Design a protein around this nucleic acid. Structure first.
Ligand code: MG
Length: 463
RNA sequence: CAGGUCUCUCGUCGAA
RNA sequence: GUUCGACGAGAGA
């Protein structure tokens, strides 16, 4: 991913965008009860906490592009993954407009809670001014799409979230790319059935975890990944993708039955157009996180990428024994014979990908069921029923969440949600967590689920 | 007044 | 207590 050109939005016939400068995150009543290393991400150039240039920091992810062609490794990779997806019977027929907007099995309706993007954001128009779930009206929508058309610039916002102290100082905040309502709809029309099929089939045939429920899915993963484990991290995956990977995606979509008309949509992903504050800029390469389908297309590409690197590095290898599950850039995999991830990373580098040891380790170590994570969660066999596996989110990450709030009105819901994450750590850890919550006046006012209840509900989930 | 795509889950409500 | 629907929150990518 690379920024090709920047101009003033005025020059390009676009208004300056009002972009929020202040966090919603405030310290909670629990801020001093627990330890934590994270604060709200820098959102503006005049943050007291900066030790670096902010705008320089947030755009540094566009590391550049490699200019290479779709080589023989990619081709075989695409053919192999296309071979799996053919079993699923993905329809390339457009999704009915009502389903695409207001939801159908395997595909939830648009989010009317979120901004409608350009041009609406500068017209003072909201998604709910245009759509309504109670009524399912398409009238007003078709009119806005005919009026403003397709391929609108995406609007860049800084993501309001917790980040480590280090990333605060270095101004390393994350960016999101708001997709225009029109383009979201158009995307969902064209690729909705693929979206649905993926959401209905998390596992090793889609090669995707999108649509999984970790409480249930974790027990299935070791059965599907029965070989020697493969795992590693990427740095700035999305922004690091060079156009050649998008060429790969277009090719696999074609093998699924898609027409050049439809794979043309990917061109507007790869070669994208953005508004940030008062600037209009064009990016070549990079998945613009926030466009419709970012999760699924990122996962599909991840599936191409890993196969490619395997075939490049181990010439001769049999992919039919290979298994992988991606969520965007997050990946867990297995092969019956050992694989040196550090070599895959070196091949990665040549393709413009930055691959590091899993979970920010500093050497590419053996990946074990003991130390492998996925969706920030460890794997732990139940002591009683060893075929059931606990998704174990680190108490320290749970601690980071509880120390902040965007609205103390939500304290009950917030803490209860964390309890459903925490209990998988064990009765002892849970109770300690419950105690510290009760060690403070607001804590003693909350209704908190008992361990035994959580365990019972979970066990019941498998019946 | 402004802050994406999505998945899962919890909670409140409410219809047969 | 199921299934379904609308709202809010949390987490993950
Ligand atoms: Mg990972």
């Amino acid at each position: 991913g690379e920024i090709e050109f920047i101009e003033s939005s005025k020059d390009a016939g676009f208004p300056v965008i009002n972009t929020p400068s202040k966090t919603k995150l405030e310290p909670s009543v629990f801020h001093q009860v627990f330890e934590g290393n994270k604060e709200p991400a820098v959102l503006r150039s005049g943050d007291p906490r900066l030790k670096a240039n902010f705008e320089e920091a947030i755009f540094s992810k566009y590391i550049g592009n490699v200019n290479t062609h779709v080589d023989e490794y990619m081709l075989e990779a695409v053919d192999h993954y296309a071979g799996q997806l053919a079993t699923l019977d993905i329809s390339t027929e457009p999704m009915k407009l009502e389903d695409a907007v207001y939801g159908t099995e395997g595909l939830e309706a648009l989010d009317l809670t979120t901004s409608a993007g350009y041009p609406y954001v500068a017209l003072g128009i909201k998604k709910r001014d245009i759509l309504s779930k109670k009524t399912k009206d398409l009238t007003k929508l078709k009119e806005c799409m005919d009026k403003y058309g397709l391929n609108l610039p995406m609007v860049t916002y800084v993501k309001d979230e917790l980040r480590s102290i280090e990333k605060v100082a270095k101004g390393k905040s994350r960016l999101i790319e708001a997709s225009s309502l029109n383009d979201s709809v158009a995307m969902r029309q064209t690729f909705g059935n693929l979206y649905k099929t993926f959401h209905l089939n998390p596992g090793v045939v889609t090669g995707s975890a999108v649509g999984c429920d970790p409480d249930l899915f974790w027990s299935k993963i070791p059965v599907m990944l029965d070989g020697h484990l493969i795992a590693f991290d990427y740095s700035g995956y999305d922004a690091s993708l060079s156009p050649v990977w998008f060429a790969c995606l277009k090719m696999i979509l074609e093998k699924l039955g898609y027409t050049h008309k439809e794979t043309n949509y990917i061109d507007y992903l790869c070669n994208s157009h953005h508004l940030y504050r008062d600037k209009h800029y064009f990016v070549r390469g990079g998945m613009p996180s926030g466009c419709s389908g970012t999760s699924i297309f990122n996962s599909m590409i991840n599936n191409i990428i890993i196969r490619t690197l395997m075939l490049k590095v181990y010439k001769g290898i049999d992919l039919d024994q290979f298994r992988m599950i991606a969520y965007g850039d997050d990946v867990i995999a297995s092969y019956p014979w050992p694989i040196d991830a550090s070599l895959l990373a070196e091949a990665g580098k040549g393709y413009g990908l930055i691959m590091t040891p899993a979970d920010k380790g500093e050497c590419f170590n053996e990946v074990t069921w003991t130390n492998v994570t996925f969706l920030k969660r460890y794997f732990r066999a139940d002591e009683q029923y060893p075929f059931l596996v606990h998704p174990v989110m680190p108490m320290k990450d749970i601690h980071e969440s509880i120390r902040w709030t965007k609205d103390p009105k939500n304290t009950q819901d917030h803490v209860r949600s964390l309890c459903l994450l925490a209990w998988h750590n064990g009765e002892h850890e849970y109770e300690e967590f419950i105690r510290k919550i009760r060690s403070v006046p607001v804590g003693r006012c909350l209704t908190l689920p008992a361990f035994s209840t959580l365990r019972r509900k979970w066990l019941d989930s498998f019946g």
